[PDB]
Amino acid sequence: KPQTELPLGWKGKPLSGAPDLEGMRVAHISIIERLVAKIGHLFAELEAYKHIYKTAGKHPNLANVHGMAVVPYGNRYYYALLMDEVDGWRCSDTLRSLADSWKQGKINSEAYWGTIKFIAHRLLDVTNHLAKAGIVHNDIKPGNVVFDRASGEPVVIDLGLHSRSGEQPKGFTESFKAPELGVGGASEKSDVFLVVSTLLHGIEGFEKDPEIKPNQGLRFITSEPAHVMDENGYPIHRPGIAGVETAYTRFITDILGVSADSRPDSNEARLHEFLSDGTIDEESAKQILKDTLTGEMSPLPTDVRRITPYYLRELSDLLRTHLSSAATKQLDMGVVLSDLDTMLVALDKAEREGGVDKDQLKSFNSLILKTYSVIGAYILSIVEPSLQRIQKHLDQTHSFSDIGSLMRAHKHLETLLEVLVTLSQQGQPVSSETYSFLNRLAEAKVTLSQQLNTLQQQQESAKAQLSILINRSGSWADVARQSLQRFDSTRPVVKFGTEQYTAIHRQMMAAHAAITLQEVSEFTDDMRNFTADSIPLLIQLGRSSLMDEHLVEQREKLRELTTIAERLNRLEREWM
Amino acid sequence: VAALVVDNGSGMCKAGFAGDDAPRAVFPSIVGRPRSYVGDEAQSKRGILTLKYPIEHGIITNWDDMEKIWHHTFYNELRVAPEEHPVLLTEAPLNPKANREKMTQIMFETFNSPAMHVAIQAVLSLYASGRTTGIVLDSGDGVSHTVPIYEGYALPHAILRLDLAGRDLTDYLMKILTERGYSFTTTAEREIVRDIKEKLCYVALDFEQEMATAAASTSLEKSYELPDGQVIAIGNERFRCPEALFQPSFLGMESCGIHETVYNSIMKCDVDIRKDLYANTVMSGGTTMYPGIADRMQKEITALAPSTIKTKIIAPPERKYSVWIGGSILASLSTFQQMWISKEEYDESGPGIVHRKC
Ligand SMILES: Nc1ncnc2c1ncn2[C@@H]1O[C@H](COP(=O)(O)OP(=O)(O)OP(=O)(O)O)[C@@H](O)[C@H]1O
Ligand SMILES: [Ca+2]
C-alpha cells in the first residue's frame, strides 16, 4: 500500500465543524482529499488559532484550522495541522499578475490601486483581529498570504512564529521585519510594519532587484531621473525608487520609516490618506481579483535583473571558481561553457543599459578571456543552446551598439569550435553529429564577420556626418547656449491653479522666452535645419555604449547641441 | 425673465442664464454621501464622504443624486428660484425615453419649473457653429460621440458612441507617470493629474517622429509644480496620453479611434450628403481641447476619405462650452419660446409629453 491509500487520524479533540477523516487520503505542506496539512512549535500554533477563535472569533481572511492530525508521509507518520485549502495563488503571484494586467491595459489605474487599498484594508483588519486576542503574527510576508479564487479574498495562512503581546517573537523574516522586531517584545505595531513591507514588495516589484530589502522603504531621487530608459525612449519604473512625495510614499514613510512608538496601529493605518482616499467598492475589488486569479498567471521574471557592480562581482565570483577548479583538476567542462554564455548575455545587457562603470566592464571582459585561456590550457548538448541564441542574434536588426556584442559572439563560437576539435585529438573522435555542428558554427562565424564589417563601415560613415554636423553649429552654439542658460535660470515651470492665479507668472515667462528668442533670431533657420539632420543621426548612434569612445564623446556633443537647438525651436510654443 | 441653461455632463456641470457668453457656474458632477454635498465642497470634504457620479457615459444612472445636483445648481450655484425661470436642459444622443420622462417629471414636480425643454447636446454644438448641417465630434469626460446632422435633424442610424474620453486619458496618464517614479493614487491626486493633462499635453501630428525626438534628447521635457511645491518633469507622456484618442489600444480597447469613428459615421449616411459632412466636421467637448488635435484630425480623415473630398475641421476656441453656448442661443430666440413645455401642458399630458415637444 502506497501512502496515498493510508488513512488519517486525530491527535487531540478536533474543533467544532471538523470533517470526517474516514474517506480522506493524501495526494512543509501536503494536500488532502479539500484540506491542507502542515507537517513543539506546531502544537503551539494550533493553540494560537484556538485562542483567536474564542477571543476574537473566526475571520474570512484568516486560515480555517480544524485541529491536529496524524498523517502518512515520508515512510512515517507525522503530526499535522489540518486546515481548509485556500484555492488560488500566493501573494507574490497575485500582485505580479495584477500589476501586469494593469500595464497591459486589461484594467485601469483606479481598478489597480483600488484593489491594492482593498488588500491593505483586509490585512490590517487581520492584524487588528489578532491584536484582539493578544497575539502577534511576527511573520507576515508574500509567502504567508494566499488569495482565494472563488471570492478574490486574501487569506493569511501561517502562525508558526507567533507570540503573545510583549514577549519575544518565535522567529521572523529578516528581509521584511521591523527594526525593533527580535531585538531587546513583539507588538501589533510590528505586524503593521510587516503588512506594509509585504505590500511594498508586490507594488514596487522587489523580486526583480534582490539587492534591496522591502523594510528599507523607498529611496527618493528628486533632482535626477527616478527611472531608467528602454530601447525606444519609454521610462521604466525602478523598484524602491520614488520621484515625488505622494500619499503612497507618505504611507510607506509614516509606517516603515518611524519607530514603533510613532508608528500607527492597524486601525490608525486604515485612516491614512493613502487608504482613505482613492478607494473602490469591496465587491468591485473582489471581482478584479477573481478575474486575475481565473486568468493567466504572470510568471516569475527570469534574467530581468539589472547588471549592477554587486551583481557583476557575483558573476565574476562564479568564473573564479572555475579557474580554481581547473588548477585542482576538477574543472567541470560542461558548466563552464554554459556559464560563460550567460556572462556574454550579461555583458551585452550591461552595455545597452547603463549603471556599471566601463572600467568594470573591461575588467569583466578580460576575466572572460582569461577563462578561455585557462580552458584552452586545460587540454554538444550543452553548447547547442549557445549557438541557437547567437543565431537568433544574427537574424535581428543590428545597430552600432551590437558591434562589441558580435565580436565577443565570434570569439565564443571560435572557442566552442576549438574545444570540440581539440577533444577529438586525444579523446573521443569527431562524430557525425559533432561534424555537422562544426560547420554550423563555421557558417555562423562567416555571417558574423560579414555583418560586422558592414556595421563598422556604416559607423565610419556616421562618424563622418557627425563631424560635419558639429561644424555647422559653430556659428550659433555658444551664443544660443548662453541664452538658453539665462532662460533656464529663471526656472521655467507650469504652475498649478487657475489662469487668473497663474496669469502674472505665465506672462513673465513669455517675456523671458521672447527675449531669449530675440538673441538667437539670426540662427532660427540654421537651428531648425540642424535638428532635422541631427535627430535622425542621434537615433542611428543610440544611447548605448560604443567601442569607439571618441565617437561616444562626440555623440554627446551633438546631443547637447541638438537639445539646445530643438528647445529654442519649440520655445515659442512652450511658453508663449 | 431670463431662461436657465443647464448642461449636465459626466464630469462637469455647466449652468447659467440664456443670453450670456459663458456659463456662470461650472462645477464637478459629484455627489458625496456620508460614510450630503455637491461639487467642490464634496471634494473638499471627501474625508467623510463617498463620492459618486450620477452621470455615466453621458447617461443618468442615479436619479436621486441627479436631483441633488440640480438642487445645488439652482439654490447654491445659480442661486435662483426654479419656479420663476424656464429651464433648458441637455441630453446625450440616444438617451432612453424613460430617462427623458423622468427628467421631465423632476423639473415639474420637484422644482416646479414654469416651462422646460431638453435638447441633444451635439446638436446644440452645431448651432453654436452657426450650422444646421454637419457632423459633430463631442468628447467629454465620460463619453465620445459622432453625430451626423442634416438640415437640423440628427441621423440616429449613423450616430456612434465611443466609451473613450477625458477620465480615461487622465487614468492613463496616472499609469504611465508611475514609470517615472510618480505614484498618484488618490482622488485628489487624480484631479492634479487631470490638471497636468490639461496643461502639458498635446496631439502630435506625427506620433512616431515625436517619439524619436523624445528618445533622442530632453528637448520635449516640461516641468510641473504641485500645489505643495514639488516639481515633476514629464516627457513623451505629453503626447502619448492624447494619442490614445487615435489609438484606443493604448487603453486596452479594441475599438476605432475618434478619426475613424467620425469616418464611419459619415460613411453610414447617404452618399449625396457625405460631402457636406466632410466640409463641416465640428468638434465639441473638453477632450477635444488638446493643442494640435485639429491638424491631426484633418490629416487622419484625409487619409481615409476619397481624394476628391474636401475636409474642413471647425474647432472653436472654447469648445468645452459649445453645448452650453448653443443652449444659451436657442433659449434666447423668441421664435423658440413656442417650443417650451409649459407647466400647464405637463399637468394635462404628464411626463410622456417630452416625446412630442422635445
Ligand atoms: N484644455 C484641456 N485639455 C484637455 N482636456 C480638457 C481641457 N479642458 C477640459 N478637459 C477635459 O474635458 C473633460 C470635461 O469636458 P466636458 O465638460 O465637455 O465633458 P462632460 O460633459 O463632463 O463629459 P461627457 O460629455 O462625457 O458627459 C474633463 O475630463 C477634462 O479633463
Ligand atoms: Ca457633455
Full residue range of the structural domain in which residue A181 is found: 40-63+85-305
Percent helix / strand / coil, chain B, rounded to 5: 45, 20, 35
Which atom of ligand 1 is found nearest the CA of B323? 18
Q: What's the rounded Cα separation, in Å, for the pair B192 and A236?
A: 22
Identify the residue whose cell numbers are 572557442.
A415
Q: What's the rounded Cα separation, in Å, for the pair B341 and B109?
A: 13
CB B14 within 8 A of CB B321: yes
CB B279 within 8 A of CB B308: no
Q: In the Cβ-directed half-sphere of A175, how many Cα atoms lie within 13 Å? A: 15
The verdict on a CB contact (< 8 Å) between B219 and A567 is: yes
The reply to whether A133 and A233 lie within a common domain is yes
CATH at B267: 3.30.420.40
Q: Is A108 annotated as a binding residue?
A: no
Domain boundary among A459, A481, A500: A459
Fill in the amino acid letter for A246.
Answer: T
Domain boundary among A267, A286, A305: A305
Give which of A200, A59, A216 is closest to A141, Cα–Cα: A200
Give which of A246, A137, A239 is closest to A192, Cα–Cα: A137
Strand partners, A80: A69
The reply to whether B85 and B178 lie within a common domain is no
The reply to whether B66 and B187 lie within a common domain is no
Domain boundary among A305, A336, A353: A305
**DSSP, res A233:** S
Fill in the amino acid letter for A119.
Answer: I
Q: What's the rounded Cα separation, in Å, for the pair A526 and A533?
A: 11
Please tell me if the CB atom of residue B319 comes closer than 6 angstroms to any atom of ligand 1.
Answer: no
Cell of A573: 510654443
The reply to whether B106 and B6 lie within a common domain is yes
Give which of B257, B319, B235 is closest to B283, Cα–Cα: B319
The reply to whether A149 and A183 lie within a common domain is yes
Count structural domains, chain A. Answer: 5
Give which of A148, A181, A167 is closest to A62, Cα–Cα: A148
The reply to whether A422 and A435 lie within a common domain is yes
Give which of A361, A460, A455 is closest to A403, Cα–Cα: A455
CB B193 within 8 A of CB B185: no
Q: How far is the CA of B166 from the centre of ligand 1 (A)?
A: 6
Which residues, at least 6 apart from B238, have a Cβ–Cβ distance to it below 8 Å? B200, B201, B202, B220, B222
Full residue range of the structural domain in which residue B349 is found: 1-121+323-357
Instruction: List gaps in chain B by the residue before each (C–N > 2.5 Å).
Output: 35
Give which of A264, A267, A207, A268 is closest to A239, Cα–Cα: A207
The reply to whether B291 and B316 lie within a common domain is yes
Active site amino acids of A: 139
Determine which helix (DSSP H) or strand (DSSP E) holds B40, and give its type and residue range.
helix B40-44
Q: What's the rounded Cα separation, in Å, for the pair A222 and A241?
A: 10
Cell of A61: 481572511
Count structural domains, chain B. Answer: 3
A250 C-beta neighbours (distance < 10 Å), count: 14
The reply to whether B149 and B270 lie within a common domain is yes
Closest residue on chain B to A531 (Cα): B213
Testing ligand 1's pocket by substitution, the residue of B6, B8, B12, B161 carrying the most ligand atoms inside 8 A of its CB is B12
Q: What's the rounded Cα separation, in Å, for the pair A221 and A224?
A: 6
CATH at B231: 3.90.640.10
Q: What's the rounded Cα separation, in Å, for the pair A78 and A387?
A: 50
Which residues, at least 6 apart from A140, have a Cβ–Cβ distance to it below 8 Å? A123, A127, A156, A176, A191, A194, A195, A198
Q: Does B35 touch chain A (CB under 8 A)?
A: no
- Cβ-Cβ contacts under 8 Å, A466 against chain B: none
The reply to whether B279 and B246 lie within a common domain is no
B80: left (phi over 0), alpha (psi -120 to 50) or beta: beta
Q: Is B107 annotated as a binding residue?
A: no
Instruction: List gaps in chain A by the residue before each (C–N > 2.5 Å).
Output: 27, 33, 39, 184, 379
Q: What's the rounded Cα separation, in Å, for the pair A186 and A167?
A: 6
Closest residue on chain A to B227 (Cα): A496
Which atom of ligand 1 is found nearest the CA of B29? 22
Domain boundary among B200, B230, B255: B255
The reply to whether A234 and A119 lie within a common domain is yes
Give which of B97, B143, B116 is closest to B341, Cα–Cα: B116
Give B137-192 as a DSSP string.
Answer: EEE-SS-EEEEEEETTEE-GGG-EEE---HHHHHHHHHHHHGGGT----SHHHHHH
Which residues, at least 6 apart from B81, have a Cβ–Cβ distance to it below 8 Å? B74
Which residues, at least 6 apart from A268, have a Cβ–Cβ distance to it below 8 Å? none
CB B339 within 8 A of CB B357: yes
The reply to whether A421 and A553 lie within a common domain is no
CB A177 within 8 A of CB A256: no
Q: How far is the CA of B54 from the centre of ligand 2 (A)?
A: 13
The reply to whether A211 and A350 lie within a common domain is no
Q: What's the rounded Cα separation, in Å, for the pair B138 and B165?
A: 10
Strand partners, A32: A26, A35
Which among B179, B187, B226 is the nearest to A277, CB-wise?
B187
Q: How far is the CA of B46 from the centre of ligand 2 (A)?
A: 24
The reply to whether B129 and B8 lie within a common domain is no
Determine which helix (DSSP H) or strand (DSSP E) holds A401, and give its type and residue range.
none
CB B311 within 8 A of CB B301: yes
Shortest distance, CA A268 to any CA of chain B (angstroms)? 14
Q: What's the rounded Cα separation, in Å, for the pair B229 and A491?
A: 13
The reply to whether B91 and B25 lie within a common domain is yes
Determine which helix (DSSP H) or strand (DSSP E) holds A389, and give its type and residue range.
helix A384-394
| Experimental approach taken | X-ray
Q: What are phi and psi of A438, to 5 degrees?
A: -60, -40
The reply to whether A348 and A390 lie within a common domain is no
Q: What's the rounded Cα separation, in Å, for the pair A553 and A560?
A: 11
Please tell me if the CB atom of residue B54 comes closer than 6 angstroms to any atom of ligand 1.
Answer: no
Give which of A571, A563, A573, A574 is closest to A534, Cα–Cα: A563
The reply to whether A49 and A114 lie within a common domain is yes
CB B55 within 8 A of CB B6: no
Strand partners, A72: A77
The reply to whether A131 and A10 lie within a common domain is no
The verdict on a CB contact (< 8 Å) between B195 and A496 is: yes
**DSSP, res A483:** H
Domain boundary among B207, B222, B255: B255
The reply to whether A112 and A142 lie within a common domain is yes
The reply to whether A148 and A223 lie within a common domain is yes
Fill in the amino acid letter for A563.
Answer: T
Q: How far is the CA of B141 from the centre of ligand 1 (A)?
A: 5
Enumerate the H helices of A427-502 as residue ranges: 432-473, 477-488
Shortest distance, CA A496 to any CA of chain B (angstroms)? 6
Give A174-220 as a DSSP string.
Answer: TTT--SSTT-----HHHHHHHHHHHHHHHHHTGGG-TTS-GGG--EE
The reply to whether B129 and B211 lie within a common domain is no
The reply to whether B275 and B340 lie within a common domain is no
Q: Please, what is the end-to-end C-alpha distance for chain A in angstroms? A: 86
Q: Does B53 touch chain A (CB under 8 A)?
A: no
The verdict on a CB contact (< 8 Å) between B183 and A226 is: no
The reply to whether B197 and B270 lie within a common domain is no
CB A114 within 8 A of CB A278: yes
Q: In what order do the strands lie in the sheet with B25-28?
A: B25-28, B12-17, B4-8, B87-91, B115-120, B341-342
The reply to whether A343 and A392 lie within a common domain is no
The reply to whether B83 and B112 lie within a common domain is yes
B150 C-beta neighbours (distance < 10 Å), count: 17
Residues in chain A: 576
